[PDB]
Amino acid sequence: TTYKLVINGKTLKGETTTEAVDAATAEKVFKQYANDNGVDGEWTYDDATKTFTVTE
Amino acid sequence: TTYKLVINGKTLKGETTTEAVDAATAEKVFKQYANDNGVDGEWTYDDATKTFTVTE
Amino acid sequence: PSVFLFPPKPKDTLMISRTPEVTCVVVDVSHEDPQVKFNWYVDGVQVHNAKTKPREQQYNSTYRVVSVLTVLHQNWLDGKEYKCKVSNKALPAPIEKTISKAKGQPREPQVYTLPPSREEMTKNQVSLTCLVKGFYPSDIAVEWESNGQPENNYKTTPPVLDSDGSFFLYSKLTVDKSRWQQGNVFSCSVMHEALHNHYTQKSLSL
Amino acid sequence: PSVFLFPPKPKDTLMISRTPEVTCVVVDVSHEDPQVKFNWYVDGVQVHNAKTKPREQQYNSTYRVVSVLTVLHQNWLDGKEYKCKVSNKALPAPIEKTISKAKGQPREPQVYTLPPSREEMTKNQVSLTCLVKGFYPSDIAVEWESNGQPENNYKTTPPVLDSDGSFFLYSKLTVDKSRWQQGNVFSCSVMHEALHNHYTQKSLSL
């Protein structure tokens, strides 16, 4: 459990976490946060770190 | 144009007409009249006569 | 060479004013042996000039003989057996394909209609949806019409198998937002073996 | 014998946390000649241990060798070319199948949601409908979820071609009438190449 998102987006730099089952129900969570904020970019994981990355 | 329907149904005997393009838009017309009335049966045409027949 | 049997189009069997046709198609015909004789037997008895019609079609490097038997709405609908019997000197013995209407207790379909999304109204043309769920067999056909006249700009997803053994299809008709707002009465007619009168038609209006 | 190429499952390419795999399948393998060597080249360059994995499957009276190359989400999505190169002594020369992601300017899909019919409420379970129209390419995938959790009892009609070159699919999620009335928030997530963030999710509540 527990995945964190990294937003390296235009004029919005930062990070957040989410309690989830599978990684994919992290993606759908963060990814939504991402459009709730107007971030739009490429994405990445990294099970080594259980992380996600948005790069506008 | 002009097709007529023959209802030989249980406790409803009679006939009617309808202005239509193709025969099939007669079928859909009468056939609806048929369920609007609670007639339910087998159907027939007869281009010789441009007629339809409901036989409960 | 090979034979291929084909069943009538759902609509051709469910509407009386139409014509159900069973299509027998022969392939890999070649050129020195094109005399492909046709035998059709309905539920056993042979139906000679049942209608029974053929015609040569040249291509590839083989011919393609095709015969077509006009069926009887009620027989097909009562699960009768259609037999195409192909014979021709290029073969050792008669080939025979049979075909029948799907078997199973028929489940009358339910037909609901839903208007556009409050959100799709922002646009120029909106979508009228017509649900037809819980039915079997999967052979069915939908159409749309507004006041006594048939719309055209519509599409209909093929039947999909639902989790309860019954089937479900969605059919979407489109319109300039104006008619939808003017207050027009759209109407999705559904045609099916299971319904009363092989027909229904549920409305839909603002 | 014969080779058969297969593209990743739409969802495997659109969700980062997943794995896009291109599947090469060899058939009519026989028994005296099963050494079917595998060559995969991504957009030209050869990708050796790209992952590249095989394994014997005995049946019929022929084998069926299968290799699978783990693709890169962005490449496939950028229309890169995947090459499966099969070779084995039972053949005169190398066979090569290529495969690519559909081509065309992508049309962002629109996602509307509609509640049950006032008429289907009379029943025990009602149907939540989720429209996704006007899109291309046809590769897409929908899912549903209520509060942070995924429902399951749902079905999704395959994409159908609409009259304007765009595509349209309907996806229907079911529920005991109670939850629908209790006031639950259902939510149809749509995943697509064209959307912002390869994702959207529109709600739906009483």
Short mmCIF file of C-alpha atoms in Angstrom, two decimals:
data_model
loop_
_atom_site.label_atom_id
_atom_site.label_comp_id
_atom_site.label_asym_id
_atom_site.label_seq_id
_atom_site.Cartn_x
_atom_site.Cartn_y
_atom_site.Cartn_z
CA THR A 1 0.00 0.00 0.00
CA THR A 2 0.94 3.73 -0.19
CA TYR A 3 2.00 5.29 -3.54
CA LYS A 4 3.29 8.83 -4.00
CA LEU A 5 3.00 11.13 -7.07
CA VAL A 6 5.54 13.57 -8.40
CA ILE A 7 4.18 16.51 -10.39
CA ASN A 8 6.95 18.29 -12.40
CA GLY A 9 4.38 20.31 -14.25
CA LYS A 10 4.38 23.83 -15.67
CA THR A 11 3.99 26.26 -12.82
CA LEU A 12 3.12 23.45 -10.32
CA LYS A 13 5.90 21.52 -8.65
CA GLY A 14 5.15 19.08 -5.83
CA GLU A 15 4.21 15.70 -4.37
CA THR A 16 1.42 13.66 -2.79
CA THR A 17 0.44 10.25 -1.44
CA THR A 18 -2.43 7.81 -1.60
CA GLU A 19 -3.66 4.77 0.19
CA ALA A 20 -4.46 2.12 -2.38
CA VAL A 21 -4.79 -1.58 -3.14
CA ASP A 22 -2.94 -2.26 -6.43
CA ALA A 23 -0.68 0.23 -8.23
CA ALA A 24 -3.26 0.70 -10.89
CA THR A 25 -5.69 2.09 -8.30
CA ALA A 26 -3.06 4.61 -7.54
CA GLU A 27 -2.70 5.61 -11.13
CA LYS A 28 -6.44 6.24 -11.42
CA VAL A 29 -6.36 8.20 -8.13
CA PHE A 30 -3.34 10.45 -8.83
CA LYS A 31 -4.14 10.73 -12.48
CA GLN A 32 -7.47 12.25 -11.49
CA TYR A 33 -5.78 14.63 -9.05
CA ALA A 34 -3.70 15.52 -12.13
CA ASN A 35 -6.68 16.67 -14.17
CA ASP A 36 -8.32 18.22 -11.18
CA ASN A 37 -5.29 20.50 -11.24
CA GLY A 38 -4.67 21.01 -14.94
CA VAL A 39 -1.45 19.03 -15.08
CA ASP A 40 -1.09 17.11 -18.31
CA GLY A 41 1.99 15.15 -19.19
CA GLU A 42 3.81 11.86 -19.50
CA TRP A 43 3.70 9.30 -16.78
CA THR A 44 6.03 6.80 -15.04
CA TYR A 45 6.09 4.34 -12.19
CA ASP A 46 9.07 2.72 -10.30
CA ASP A 47 8.08 -0.14 -7.98
CA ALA A 48 11.53 0.19 -6.44
CA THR A 49 10.07 3.37 -5.05
CA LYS A 50 6.32 2.85 -5.55
CA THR A 51 6.28 6.21 -7.26
CA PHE A 52 4.62 8.03 -10.13
CA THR A 53 5.88 10.93 -12.23
CA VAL A 54 3.99 13.63 -14.21
CA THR A 55 6.17 15.65 -16.53
CA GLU A 56 4.29 18.39 -18.28
CA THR B 1 -50.09 3.87 -51.17
CA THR B 2 -53.02 2.75 -48.94
CA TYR B 3 -52.85 -0.61 -47.07
CA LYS B 4 -55.68 -2.15 -45.07
CA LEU B 5 -55.50 -4.48 -42.01
CA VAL B 6 -57.74 -7.38 -41.16
CA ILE B 7 -58.04 -8.26 -37.47
CA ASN B 8 -59.57 -11.76 -36.95
CA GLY B 9 -58.71 -11.65 -33.29
CA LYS B 10 -60.38 -13.05 -30.19
CA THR B 11 -63.37 -10.91 -29.37
CA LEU B 12 -62.33 -8.20 -31.91
CA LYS B 13 -63.26 -8.59 -35.55
CA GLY B 14 -62.70 -5.75 -38.02
CA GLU B 15 -60.67 -3.71 -40.51
CA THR B 16 -58.72 -0.49 -41.03
CA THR B 17 -56.60 1.49 -43.48
CA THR B 18 -53.41 3.51 -43.54
CA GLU B 19 -51.66 5.95 -45.75
CA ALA B 20 -48.08 4.82 -46.16
CA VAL B 21 -44.96 4.84 -48.33
CA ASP B 22 -43.67 1.23 -48.53
CA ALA B 23 -45.56 -1.84 -47.30
CA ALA B 24 -43.19 -2.18 -44.42
CA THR B 25 -44.31 1.21 -43.10
CA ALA B 26 -47.76 -0.19 -43.08
CA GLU B 27 -46.72 -3.21 -41.11
CA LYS B 28 -45.14 -1.02 -38.43
CA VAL B 29 -48.28 1.19 -38.39
CA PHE B 30 -50.96 -1.55 -38.21
CA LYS B 31 -48.82 -3.78 -36.07
CA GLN B 32 -48.74 -1.00 -33.50
CA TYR B 33 -52.51 -0.52 -33.73
CA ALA B 34 -52.53 -4.28 -33.03
CA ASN B 35 -50.75 -3.95 -29.69
CA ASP B 36 -52.59 -0.79 -28.85
CA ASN B 37 -55.63 -3.06 -28.90
CA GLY B 38 -54.34 -6.27 -27.39
CA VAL B 39 -54.49 -8.30 -30.58
CA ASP B 40 -51.65 -10.76 -30.85
CA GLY B 41 -51.36 -13.26 -33.66
CA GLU B 42 -49.84 -14.36 -36.92
CA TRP B 43 -49.45 -12.00 -39.80
CA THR B 44 -49.81 -12.00 -43.62
CA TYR B 45 -49.65 -9.67 -46.57
CA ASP B 46 -51.02 -10.05 -50.18
CA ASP B 47 -49.78 -7.40 -52.62
CA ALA B 48 -52.54 -8.54 -54.96
CA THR B 49 -54.74 -6.85 -52.41
CA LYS B 50 -52.25 -4.72 -50.46
CA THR B 51 -53.65 -6.29 -47.33
CA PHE B 52 -52.55 -7.52 -43.92
CA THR B 53 -54.06 -10.20 -41.70
CA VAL B 54 -53.94 -10.70 -37.89
CA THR B 55 -55.19 -14.07 -36.74
CA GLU B 56 -55.21 -14.41 -32.99
CA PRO C 1 -14.09 -26.55 -53.66
CA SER C 2 -16.49 -25.67 -50.82
CA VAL C 3 -20.10 -24.94 -49.88
CA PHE C 4 -21.32 -22.22 -47.44
CA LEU C 5 -24.79 -21.82 -45.98
CA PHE C 6 -26.39 -18.60 -44.83
CA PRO C 7 -29.48 -17.74 -42.70
CA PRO C 8 -32.02 -14.94 -43.46
CA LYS C 9 -31.43 -11.47 -42.10
CA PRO C 10 -33.30 -11.09 -38.81
CA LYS C 11 -35.41 -8.27 -40.16
CA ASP C 12 -36.38 -10.31 -43.23
CA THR C 13 -37.97 -12.94 -40.94
CA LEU C 14 -39.55 -10.78 -38.36
CA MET C 15 -41.42 -8.48 -40.73
CA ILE C 16 -44.13 -10.19 -42.75
CA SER C 17 -43.95 -7.81 -45.71
CA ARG C 18 -40.40 -9.02 -46.30
CA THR C 19 -38.60 -12.05 -47.67
CA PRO C 20 -36.52 -14.51 -45.76
CA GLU C 21 -33.87 -16.05 -48.03
CA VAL C 22 -31.42 -18.82 -47.19
CA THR C 23 -28.23 -18.39 -49.27
CA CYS C 24 -26.12 -21.29 -50.53
CA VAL C 25 -22.68 -20.23 -51.78
CA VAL C 26 -20.23 -22.48 -53.67
CA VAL C 27 -16.54 -21.60 -53.91
CA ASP C 28 -13.26 -22.62 -55.61
CA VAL C 29 -15.37 -23.35 -58.66
CA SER C 30 -12.58 -23.67 -61.29
CA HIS C 31 -13.17 -23.56 -64.99
CA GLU C 32 -13.55 -27.09 -66.33
CA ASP C 33 -16.04 -28.16 -63.72
CA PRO C 34 -18.71 -25.48 -63.04
CA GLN C 35 -21.89 -27.63 -63.25
CA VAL C 36 -22.83 -27.43 -59.58
CA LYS C 37 -26.34 -28.89 -59.26
CA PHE C 38 -28.62 -27.61 -56.52
CA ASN C 39 -30.74 -29.50 -54.04
CA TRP C 40 -32.82 -27.93 -51.33
CA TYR C 41 -34.92 -29.82 -48.89
CA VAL C 42 -37.09 -28.13 -46.32
CA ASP C 43 -37.14 -30.10 -43.08
CA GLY C 44 -36.62 -33.18 -45.23
CA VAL C 45 -38.92 -32.94 -48.19
CA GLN C 46 -37.29 -31.53 -51.30
CA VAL C 47 -38.48 -28.13 -52.37
CA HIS C 48 -37.82 -28.00 -56.11
CA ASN C 49 -38.66 -24.72 -57.63
CA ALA C 50 -39.10 -23.51 -53.98
CA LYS C 51 -37.95 -20.37 -55.77
CA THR C 52 -34.48 -21.62 -56.09
CA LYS C 53 -32.31 -19.34 -58.26
CA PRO C 54 -28.53 -19.41 -59.30
CA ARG C 55 -25.97 -17.41 -61.53
CA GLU C 56 -22.24 -17.47 -62.61
CA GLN C 57 -19.66 -15.08 -61.00
CA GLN C 58 -16.14 -15.25 -62.46
CA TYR C 59 -13.02 -14.20 -60.45
CA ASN C 60 -9.67 -15.11 -58.81
CA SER C 61 -9.26 -18.11 -61.11
CA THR C 62 -12.31 -20.08 -59.85
CA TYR C 63 -16.05 -19.49 -60.30
CA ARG C 64 -18.63 -19.01 -57.50
CA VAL C 65 -22.08 -20.51 -58.03
CA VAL C 66 -24.82 -19.20 -55.75
CA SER C 67 -28.38 -20.39 -55.22
CA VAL C 68 -30.93 -18.79 -52.91
CA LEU C 69 -34.07 -20.35 -51.38
CA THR C 70 -36.92 -18.05 -50.29
CA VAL C 71 -37.86 -19.23 -46.82
CA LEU C 72 -41.15 -19.12 -44.95
CA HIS C 73 -41.23 -16.67 -42.07
CA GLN C 74 -43.03 -19.07 -39.74
CA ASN C 75 -40.99 -22.18 -40.55
CA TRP C 76 -37.59 -20.61 -39.89
CA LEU C 77 -39.18 -19.07 -36.87
CA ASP C 78 -40.38 -22.46 -35.79
CA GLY C 79 -36.95 -23.93 -36.24
CA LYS C 80 -37.27 -25.82 -39.48
CA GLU C 81 -34.19 -27.26 -41.21
CA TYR C 82 -32.75 -25.78 -44.39
CA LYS C 83 -30.65 -28.07 -46.61
CA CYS C 84 -28.27 -27.08 -49.37
CA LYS C 85 -27.11 -30.06 -51.43
CA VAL C 86 -24.28 -29.29 -53.85
CA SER C 87 -23.09 -31.82 -56.46
CA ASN C 88 -20.76 -31.51 -59.51
CA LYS C 89 -18.38 -33.85 -61.33
CA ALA C 90 -15.25 -32.32 -59.72
CA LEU C 91 -16.27 -34.09 -56.50
CA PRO C 92 -16.61 -37.75 -55.40
CA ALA C 93 -19.88 -37.28 -53.59
CA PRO C 94 -22.67 -34.83 -52.58
CA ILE C 95 -21.90 -32.28 -49.88
CA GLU C 96 -24.67 -31.21 -47.50
CA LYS C 97 -24.81 -28.27 -45.12
CA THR C 98 -27.81 -27.79 -42.85
CA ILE C 99 -28.68 -24.71 -40.90
CA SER C 100 -31.23 -23.78 -38.33
CA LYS C 101 -32.48 -20.95 -36.21
CA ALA C 102 -30.74 -20.70 -32.89
CA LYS C 103 -32.28 -22.91 -30.19
CA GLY C 104 -33.30 -21.94 -26.70
CA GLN C 105 -36.34 -20.71 -24.85
CA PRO C 106 -36.74 -17.12 -26.17
CA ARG C 107 -36.58 -14.32 -23.65
CA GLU C 108 -38.72 -11.33 -24.45
CA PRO C 109 -36.55 -8.23 -24.57
CA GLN C 110 -37.14 -5.17 -22.49
CA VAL C 111 -36.95 -1.77 -24.34
CA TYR C 112 -36.08 1.40 -22.30
CA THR C 113 -35.23 4.79 -23.74
CA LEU C 114 -32.96 7.48 -22.34
CA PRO C 115 -32.57 11.11 -23.44
CA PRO C 116 -29.24 12.91 -23.76
CA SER C 117 -27.00 13.81 -20.93
CA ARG C 118 -27.60 17.17 -19.35
CA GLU C 119 -23.92 17.64 -20.30
CA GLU C 120 -24.08 16.73 -23.97
CA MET C 121 -26.65 19.55 -24.50
CA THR C 122 -23.90 22.15 -24.59
CA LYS C 123 -23.32 20.86 -28.12
CA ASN C 124 -24.84 21.05 -31.63
CA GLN C 125 -26.26 17.54 -32.03
CA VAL C 126 -27.35 15.29 -29.13
CA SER C 127 -27.75 11.58 -28.78
CA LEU C 128 -31.01 9.69 -28.14
CA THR C 129 -30.23 6.26 -26.65
CA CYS C 130 -32.53 3.19 -26.90
CA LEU C 131 -31.80 0.20 -24.59
CA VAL C 132 -32.94 -3.34 -25.42
CA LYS C 133 -31.74 -5.74 -22.72
CA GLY C 134 -32.39 -9.20 -21.50
CA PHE C 135 -33.22 -11.08 -24.66
CA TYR C 136 -32.50 -14.23 -26.56
CA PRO C 137 -31.91 -15.38 -29.10
CA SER C 138 -29.48 -12.64 -30.20
CA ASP C 139 -31.23 -12.16 -33.60
CA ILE C 140 -33.02 -8.77 -33.40
CA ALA C 141 -33.35 -5.49 -35.15
CA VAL C 142 -33.98 -1.92 -34.09
CA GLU C 143 -35.09 1.15 -36.04
CA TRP C 144 -35.99 4.72 -35.12
CA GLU C 145 -38.68 7.11 -36.36
CA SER C 146 -39.99 10.52 -35.38
CA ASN C 147 -43.55 11.55 -36.41
CA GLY C 148 -44.53 8.67 -38.68
CA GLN C 149 -41.26 9.16 -40.52
CA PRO C 150 -37.94 7.31 -40.15
CA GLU C 151 -34.79 9.02 -39.03
CA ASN C 152 -31.60 7.59 -40.41
CA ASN C 153 -28.64 9.02 -38.60
CA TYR C 154 -28.46 6.27 -35.99
CA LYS C 155 -26.20 3.33 -35.13
CA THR C 156 -26.77 0.06 -33.37
CA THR C 157 -24.26 -1.95 -31.39
CA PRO C 158 -24.39 -5.70 -32.05
CA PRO C 159 -25.90 -7.90 -29.36
CA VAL C 160 -23.58 -8.69 -26.46
CA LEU C 161 -24.02 -11.55 -24.01
CA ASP C 162 -25.14 -10.39 -20.58
CA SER C 163 -24.29 -12.15 -17.30
CA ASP C 164 -27.73 -13.79 -16.96
CA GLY C 165 -27.70 -15.65 -20.24
CA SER C 166 -29.86 -12.94 -21.81
CA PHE C 167 -28.54 -10.49 -24.44
CA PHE C 168 -28.36 -6.66 -24.56
CA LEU C 169 -27.81 -4.14 -27.37
CA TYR C 170 -27.64 -0.31 -27.36
CA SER C 171 -28.80 1.74 -30.35
CA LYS C 172 -27.94 5.46 -30.65
CA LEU C 173 -29.95 8.01 -32.85
CA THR C 174 -28.63 11.54 -33.39
CA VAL C 175 -30.16 14.97 -33.86
CA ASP C 176 -29.46 18.68 -34.20
CA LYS C 177 -30.04 19.94 -30.73
CA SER C 178 -32.96 21.97 -32.01
CA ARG C 179 -35.44 19.18 -32.78
CA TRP C 180 -34.64 17.68 -29.39
CA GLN C 181 -35.55 20.95 -27.77
CA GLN C 182 -38.40 21.88 -30.09
CA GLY C 183 -40.05 19.00 -28.24
CA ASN C 184 -40.02 16.32 -30.92
CA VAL C 185 -41.27 12.78 -30.24
CA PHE C 186 -38.58 10.29 -31.18
CA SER C 187 -39.38 6.64 -31.22
CA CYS C 188 -37.20 3.56 -31.14
CA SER C 189 -39.02 0.58 -32.61
CA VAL C 190 -37.63 -2.80 -31.58
CA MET C 191 -38.43 -5.94 -33.54
CA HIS C 192 -38.12 -9.32 -32.02
CA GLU C 193 -39.18 -12.91 -32.10
CA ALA C 194 -40.16 -12.77 -28.46
CA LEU C 195 -42.36 -9.70 -28.30
CA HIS C 196 -46.10 -9.64 -28.65
CA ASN C 197 -46.69 -9.15 -32.36
CA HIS C 198 -42.99 -9.38 -33.15
CA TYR C 199 -42.90 -5.67 -32.38
CA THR C 200 -42.92 -2.81 -29.90
CA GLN C 201 -41.94 0.79 -30.06
CA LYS C 202 -41.29 2.88 -27.10
CA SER C 203 -41.32 6.63 -27.26
CA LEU C 204 -39.05 9.31 -26.06
CA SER C 205 -39.72 13.02 -25.82
CA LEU C 206 -38.57 16.10 -24.00
CA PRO D 1 3.56 -23.58 -40.73
CA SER D 2 2.57 -19.97 -39.95
CA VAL D 3 3.35 -16.87 -37.88
CA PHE D 4 0.78 -14.55 -36.20
CA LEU D 5 1.42 -11.15 -34.65
CA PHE D 6 -0.56 -9.55 -31.86
CA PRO D 7 -0.80 -5.98 -30.45
CA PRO D 8 -0.95 -5.05 -26.71
CA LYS D 9 -4.30 -4.82 -24.98
CA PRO D 10 -5.48 -1.20 -25.04
CA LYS D 11 -5.53 -1.00 -21.28
CA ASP D 12 -1.97 -2.34 -21.04
CA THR D 13 -0.73 0.66 -23.09
CA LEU D 14 -2.84 3.39 -21.68
CA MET D 15 -2.08 2.75 -18.02
CA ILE D 16 1.53 3.34 -17.05
CA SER D 17 1.55 0.85 -14.17
CA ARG D 18 0.92 -1.90 -16.71
CA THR D 19 2.79 -3.83 -19.37
CA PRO D 20 2.31 -3.64 -23.08
CA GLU D 21 3.29 -6.95 -24.72
CA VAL D 22 3.42 -7.76 -28.41
CA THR D 23 2.73 -11.49 -28.94
CA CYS D 24 4.30 -13.56 -31.71
CA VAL D 25 2.60 -16.93 -32.23
CA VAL D 26 3.94 -19.76 -34.44
CA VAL D 27 1.67 -22.56 -35.64
CA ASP D 28 1.67 -25.93 -37.45
CA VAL D 29 4.92 -26.60 -35.65
CA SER D 30 5.24 -30.38 -36.29
CA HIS D 31 7.55 -32.65 -34.40
CA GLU D 32 10.83 -33.00 -36.29
CA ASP D 33 11.29 -29.31 -36.84
CA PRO D 34 10.47 -27.24 -33.70
CA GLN D 35 13.58 -24.99 -33.54
CA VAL D 36 11.83 -21.72 -34.37
CA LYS D 37 14.36 -18.94 -33.74
CA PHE D 38 13.09 -15.52 -32.68
CA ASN D 39 13.99 -12.09 -33.97
CA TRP D 40 12.46 -8.87 -32.80
CA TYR D 41 13.36 -5.48 -34.08
CA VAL D 42 11.87 -2.32 -32.72
CA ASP D 43 11.36 0.24 -35.47
CA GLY D 44 14.34 -1.35 -37.18
CA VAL D 45 17.00 -1.92 -34.58
CA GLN D 46 17.02 -5.41 -33.13
CA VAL D 47 15.98 -5.69 -29.54
CA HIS D 48 17.69 -8.85 -28.28
CA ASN D 49 16.81 -9.69 -24.77
CA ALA D 50 14.16 -6.88 -25.11
CA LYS D 51 12.54 -9.27 -22.65
CA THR D 52 11.82 -11.77 -25.29
CA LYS D 53 10.46 -15.05 -23.85
CA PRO D 54 9.23 -18.39 -25.48
CA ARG D 55 7.90 -21.95 -24.45
CA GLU D 56 6.70 -25.29 -26.03
CA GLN D 57 2.93 -26.15 -26.26
CA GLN D 58 2.12 -29.60 -27.65
CA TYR D 59 -1.25 -30.41 -29.33
CA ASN D 60 -3.24 -31.44 -32.45
CA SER D 61 -0.17 -33.09 -33.97
CA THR D 62 1.92 -29.89 -34.34
CA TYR D 63 3.65 -27.69 -31.74
CA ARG D 64 3.03 -23.95 -31.16
CA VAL D 65 6.03 -21.81 -30.23
CA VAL D 66 5.24 -18.41 -28.73
CA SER D 67 7.49 -15.47 -27.95
CA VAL D 68 6.39 -12.21 -26.33
CA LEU D 69 8.11 -8.79 -26.46
CA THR D 70 7.40 -6.28 -23.68
CA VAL D 71 6.68 -3.02 -25.46
CA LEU D 72 7.18 0.58 -24.40
CA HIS D 73 3.98 2.46 -23.69
CA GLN D 74 5.13 5.62 -25.48
CA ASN D 75 6.63 3.93 -28.54
CA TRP D 76 3.53 1.91 -29.45
CA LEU D 77 1.59 5.02 -28.67
CA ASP D 78 3.81 6.96 -31.00
CA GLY D 79 3.33 4.42 -33.73
CA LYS D 80 6.56 2.50 -33.66
CA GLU D 81 6.97 -0.72 -35.67
CA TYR D 82 7.08 -4.14 -34.04
CA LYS D 83 8.79 -6.96 -35.96
CA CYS D 84 8.52 -10.68 -35.37
CA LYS D 85 11.08 -12.66 -37.37
CA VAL D 86 10.54 -16.43 -37.31
CA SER D 87 13.09 -18.87 -38.77
CA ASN D 88 13.45 -22.70 -38.54
CA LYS D 89 14.84 -25.41 -40.81
CA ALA D 90 11.37 -26.57 -41.97
CA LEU D 91 11.22 -23.38 -44.05
CA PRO D 92 13.17 -21.99 -47.05
CA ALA D 93 13.46 -18.48 -45.71
CA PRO D 94 12.67 -16.08 -42.81
CA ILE D 95 9.08 -14.91 -42.41
CA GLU D 96 8.40 -11.41 -41.10
CA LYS D 97 5.19 -9.89 -39.80
CA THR D 98 5.07 -6.24 -38.77
CA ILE D 99 2.38 -4.55 -36.80
CA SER D 100 1.57 -1.03 -35.80
CA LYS D 101 -0.87 1.07 -33.88
CA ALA D 102 -3.78 2.24 -35.96
CA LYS D 103 -3.09 5.45 -37.88
CA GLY D 104 -5.19 8.57 -38.03
CA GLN D 105 -5.54 11.87 -36.25
CA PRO D 106 -6.95 10.84 -32.83
CA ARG D 107 -10.30 12.27 -31.85
CA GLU D 108 -10.76 12.87 -28.16
CA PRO D 109 -13.81 10.99 -26.94
CA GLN D 110 -16.71 12.59 -25.19
CA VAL D 111 -17.99 10.79 -22.00
CA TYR D 112 -21.67 11.35 -20.92
CA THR D 113 -23.51 9.39 -18.26
CA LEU D 114 -27.20 8.57 -18.02
CA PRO D 115 -29.15 7.15 -15.07
CA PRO D 116 -31.82 4.46 -15.36
CA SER D 117 -35.12 4.86 -17.02
CA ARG D 118 -37.92 6.08 -14.83
CA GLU D 119 -39.53 2.81 -16.05
CA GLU D 120 -36.77 0.37 -15.15
CA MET D 121 -37.05 1.48 -11.47
CA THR D 122 -40.07 -0.73 -10.95
CA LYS D 123 -37.52 -3.54 -10.79
CA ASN D 124 -34.90 -5.04 -8.43
CA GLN D 125 -31.67 -4.00 -10.14
CA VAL D 126 -31.28 -0.94 -12.41
CA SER D 127 -28.84 -0.04 -15.11
CA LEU D 128 -26.34 2.85 -15.05
CA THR D 129 -25.31 3.72 -18.63
CA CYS D 130 -22.01 5.42 -19.60
CA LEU D 131 -21.71 6.87 -23.16
CA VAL D 132 -18.34 7.41 -24.86
CA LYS D 133 -18.89 8.76 -28.38
CA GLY D 134 -16.97 10.43 -31.11
CA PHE D 135 -13.54 8.91 -30.80
CA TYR D 136 -10.74 7.36 -32.76
CA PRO D 137 -8.84 5.24 -32.90
CA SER D 138 -11.23 2.51 -31.69
CA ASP D 139 -8.75 1.22 -29.04
CA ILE D 140 -10.21 2.26 -25.65
CA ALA D 141 -11.22 0.91 -22.31
CA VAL D 142 -13.85 1.75 -19.75
CA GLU D 143 -14.21 0.82 -16.08
CA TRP D 144 -16.65 1.75 -13.31
CA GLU D 145 -16.18 2.47 -9.60
CA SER D 146 -18.33 3.74 -6.76
CA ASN D 147 -16.66 5.35 -3.70
CA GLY D 148 -12.98 4.67 -4.41
CA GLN D 149 -13.89 1.06 -5.03
CA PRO D 150 -14.53 -0.78 -8.31
CA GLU D 151 -17.85 -2.31 -9.15
CA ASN D 152 -17.72 -5.36 -11.35
CA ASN D 153 -21.15 -6.24 -12.58
CA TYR D 154 -20.90 -4.22 -15.78
CA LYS D 155 -20.59 -4.87 -19.52
CA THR D 156 -19.14 -2.89 -22.37
CA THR D 157 -20.19 -3.00 -26.00
CA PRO D 158 -17.29 -3.01 -28.46
CA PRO D 159 -16.61 0.18 -30.39
CA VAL D 160 -18.87 0.75 -33.38
CA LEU D 161 -18.16 3.09 -36.28
CA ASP D 162 -20.31 6.21 -36.20
CA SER D 163 -21.43 8.16 -39.29
CA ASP D 164 -18.83 10.93 -38.83
CA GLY D 165 -15.76 8.73 -38.91
CA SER D 166 -15.59 8.83 -35.11
CA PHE D 167 -16.37 5.79 -32.92
CA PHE D 168 -18.91 5.20 -30.11
CA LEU D 169 -19.25 2.55 -27.38
CA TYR D 170 -21.87 2.06 -24.62
CA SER D 171 -20.95 0.51 -21.26
CA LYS D 172 -23.65 -0.66 -18.82
CA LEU D 173 -23.09 -1.11 -14.97
CA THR D 174 -25.77 -2.75 -12.81
CA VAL D 175 -27.00 -2.37 -9.25
CA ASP D 176 -29.59 -3.46 -6.72
CA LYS D 177 -32.10 -0.70 -6.87
CA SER D 178 -31.27 0.19 -3.30
CA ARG D 179 -27.76 1.62 -3.76
CA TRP D 180 -29.08 3.65 -6.66
CA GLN D 181 -31.70 5.13 -4.40
CA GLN D 182 -29.59 5.33 -1.26
CA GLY D 183 -27.92 8.08 -3.29
CA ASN D 184 -24.65 6.39 -4.22
CA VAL D 185 -22.09 8.09 -6.48
CA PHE D 186 -21.25 5.80 -9.37
CA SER D 187 -18.43 6.69 -11.67
CA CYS D 188 -17.53 5.55 -15.15
CA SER D 189 -13.83 6.04 -15.81
CA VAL D 190 -12.88 6.16 -19.48
CA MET D 191 -9.30 5.61 -20.62
CA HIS D 192 -8.10 6.82 -23.92
CA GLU D 193 -5.16 7.85 -26.00
CA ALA D 194 -6.83 11.13 -26.85
CA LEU D 195 -7.85 12.45 -23.46
CA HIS D 196 -5.83 14.77 -21.30
CA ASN D 197 -3.76 12.46 -19.12
CA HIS D 198 -4.99 9.37 -20.93
CA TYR D 199 -7.92 9.50 -18.52
CA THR D 200 -11.20 11.01 -17.38
CA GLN D 201 -13.96 9.86 -15.14
CA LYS D 202 -17.34 11.34 -15.12
CA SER D 203 -19.70 10.87 -12.24
CA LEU D 204 -23.27 9.91 -11.93
CA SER D 205 -25.51 10.18 -8.90
CA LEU D 206 -29.15 10.39 -7.95
#
